[PDB]
Symmetry: C3
Subunit: 204 residues, 3 copies
Amino acid sequence: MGPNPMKMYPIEGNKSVQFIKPILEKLENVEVGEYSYYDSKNGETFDKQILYHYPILNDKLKIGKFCSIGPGVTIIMNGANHRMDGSTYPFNLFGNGWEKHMPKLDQLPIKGDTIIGNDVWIGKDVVIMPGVKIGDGAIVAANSVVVKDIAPYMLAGGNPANEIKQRFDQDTINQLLDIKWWNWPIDIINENIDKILDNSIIRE
Amino acid sequence: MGPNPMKMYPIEGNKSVQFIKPILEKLENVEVGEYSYYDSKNGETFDKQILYHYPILNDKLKIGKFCSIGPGVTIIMNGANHRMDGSTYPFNLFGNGWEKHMPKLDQLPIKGDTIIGNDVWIGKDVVIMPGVKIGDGAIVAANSVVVKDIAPYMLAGGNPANEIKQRFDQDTINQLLDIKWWNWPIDIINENIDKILDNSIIRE
Amino acid sequence: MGPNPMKMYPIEGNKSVQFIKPILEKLENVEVGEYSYYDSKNGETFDKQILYHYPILNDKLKIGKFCSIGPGVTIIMNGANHRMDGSTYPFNLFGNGWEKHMPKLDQLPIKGDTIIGNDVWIGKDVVIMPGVKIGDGAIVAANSVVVKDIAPYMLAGGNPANEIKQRFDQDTINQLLDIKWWNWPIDIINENIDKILDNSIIRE
Ligand SMILES: CCN(CC)CCS(=O)(=O)[C@@H]1CCN2C(=O)c3coc(n3)CC(=O)C[C@H](O)/C=C(C)/C=C/CNC(=O)/C=C/[C@@H](C)[C@@H](C(C)C)OC(=O)[C@@H]12
Ligand SMILES: CCN(CC)CCS(=O)(=O)[C@@H]1CCN2C(=O)c3coc(n3)CC(=O)C[C@H](O)/C=C(C)/C=C/CNC(=O)/C=C/[C@@H](C)[C@@H](C(C)C)OC(=O)[C@@H]12
Ligand SMILES: CCN(CC)CCS(=O)(=O)[C@@H]1CCN2C(=O)c3coc(n3)CC(=O)C[C@H](O)/C=C(C)/C=C/CNC(=O)/C=C/[C@@H](C)[C@@H](C(C)C)OC(=O)[C@@H]12
C-alpha cells in the first residue's frame, strides 16, 4: 500500500511533487532517504537547489526519510567560502599568472557536513547555510536562514533562525527518538500511520 | 477630481500600478478597499500574490482603503499548514490507499483571518504570515517577514518583524483613529488632501 | 599581469563573472572601482540590480576597488521613500488633478548617499537599504538586510543586519587602513599578492 518509494514522480497528474532519493541517486556525496519529497516552484528538480557543492572539498549532504521540503528551499555547501586570514579577493580565479595564488589545503576552513534528520518539515524559501545539522521531527518556518544547528522536535524560524518553542515534552521526545518509526518495515508503518499522526505511537 | 477608483490601470502610460479592488472583486473570501494599489514586479496582477487560499478552510482576507503595496509582496493563507499533533508528513496526499488518512478540519491549525487596515504602506518583497492583523496607518519595512500583529501607526521591520517605533504621539494616534478620513466622501477628501498629508486634519 | 581591469567579462569561459566599472560606466551618479566584480545569478548585468535611482534626487552610489559581490545582490536608492509627515499615500502619482499635491523640496527627507568601501565581500541575495556606509575590508553574510552602517573590517549578518565580529585586532586594522594596498600600482600589487592574502603586508 502506498506510493512507490523509487518513482521520480509519485503522483501522476502532478509534476510538481517529486521523490528526492530517485532523483539524487546519481549525485556524489549526497545521501537521501526514502519518501522524502520536494515541492517544485516552477518545474525545477531538487538537484538545482543544491549550490556550491564541489567534490574536491569532500563535504557531504545527508537527508533523512519522510521529509517535507517546500518550494524554493536552498542548501548552501562549502564552495561559497572565501579565504579570510587576509584579503577576501579571489585573485586565483582570474588567472593570467594569479593562479599561483591558489589556497593551500589548510587555508580554506570547512564548516563541516550538512545533515537533515528524519521526519523534518522545511518551509518555503528557506536557506540552509554550510555545516548545519537539524534534528529529527524539527520544523523550520518559511523564509528562514539557518546558520546554527536545530535540536530535535523544535520550532525554529527567522534570519538568523532561532529556536522558538518545543513541540512536545521531554519524555515524549525521548521516546519518539528511541522508537524511530521511520525505520520500520513499510507494512508495519501502514498499520500504524494513524498512531503516527496522533502521536499515540509512544503508548503502544 | 482624481483617478477612477474602479479602473484596473488608473494611470495612462503605466502598466505597473493597479487598483486592487477591481482586480480582486472576482475572488471568493477577499474583501478589498478603494484606492489601495499594487506596484507590479514584472507585470503580474496582485491575485498571483495570494497563496494557499482555499474555500474549504473558510479563512478570509481583508484589506483596507488607501493602501500602498510594494512589488513582490506575498500573503500566505492557512493552506500551507501541515498537521502538527504528530508527524508532519502528508500521507493522504499520495493516494494508493493513503487517502483514508485525510485529516478532519478539526485536526488542522487555524490561525484566523488576515486583516490589513487603512492607509498602510507595505515595503517591497514583504511576506505576510497567516492570521496576521495590521493596524491603520502602519508602515512595514521592505523585506520583512510578519508573523505577529502590528499596532496602528507603528513602524515595523525585520525577520521576524518587530516594532521599531511610534510614528506619532498617543494623543495624535487616538485622534486619527476616530476621524477615519478615508471614509469621507471623495469630494471632501480632495479639499483636505494637503491637510491629510501633514497631519493638520487633527486641527479641525 | 592579471586580467584586464577594463574588460566586461574578464574570465574566458565564464560569462557570469563581470567587472563592475566597465558595465556601470554609462550611469550618472555612479562611481565604481577597478577589479570589483559581480557573479551573475541568471545572466543579468549588474546595472539591473540598482533600483530606485533617480537623477532628480541627486543621491550618489559609490563602490570601492577589489570588491566581491555575490549573485542576487540589490542596491536600493532613495526613490523608494514615501512622504511620512502624514499619510503615506502618493496622491500625486495618479494624476487627474492630484498632480498638484507634489511634495516640496523639503517634504522628502533623504537618507544620504550609498558608499561601499574597498576590499569588501557581499554575500548572495544581500539587500542594501538607502544611505548605508560600509567600511573597507568588511564582510556581509548572505541574505542580510543592511539598514545601518558597518565599520571597517567587521563581520555583519541578519535582518536587520548586526555586527557580529571584528576580523582582526585594532592595531592591524589601523595599519591596514593606513597603507591602502588597493591604491598601489598594479605592478607593485602583483609582487605582494601572497603578502596581502595572509595579512603579512603590515610588517614590511
Ligand atoms: C578545472 C576545474 N574547473 C573546470 C573548468 C572549475 C572547477 S573548480 O573546482 O577549479 C572551481 C572553479 C572556480 N572555483 C569556483 O567556486 C568557481 C569557478 O568560477 C566561479 N566560481 C564563478 C564564481 O563562483 C566566483 C566566486 O566569487 C568564486 C568563489 C566563491 C571562490 C571561493 C574560493 N574558491 C576556492 O578556494 C578555489 C579552490 C580551487 C582549488 C578549485 C579546485 C581546483 C580545488 O575549486 C573551486 O572552488 C573553483
Ligand atoms: C479532490 C480535491 N482536489 C482536486 C483533485 C485537490 C484539492 S484538495 O482540497 O484535496 C488539496 C490537494 C492537496 N492539498 C494541497 O494543499 C495540494 C494538492 O497537491 C499539492 N498540494 C502539491 C502540494 O501543495 C504539496 C504540499 O506539500 C501539500 C501541503 C502543503 C499539505 C498541507 C496539509 N494539507 C491538508 O491538511 C489537506 C486537507 C485536505 C482534507 C484537502 C481537502 C480535501 C479538505 O485540502 C488540501 O489542502 C489539498
Ligand atoms: C512627469 C514626471 N514623470 C514622467 C511621467 C514621472 C517621473 S516622477 O519623478 O513624477 C516619479 C513618478 C512617480 N514617482 C515614482 O517613484 C513612480 C511613478 O510611477 C511609479 N513610481 C510606480 C511606483 O514606483 C509605485 C511606488 O509605490 C511609488 C513610490 C515608491 C513613491 C515614493 C515616494 N515618491 C515621491 O516622493 C514622489 C516625488 C515626486 C515629487 C516625483 C517628482 C516629480 C519630484 O518623483 C517621483 O519619485 C515619481
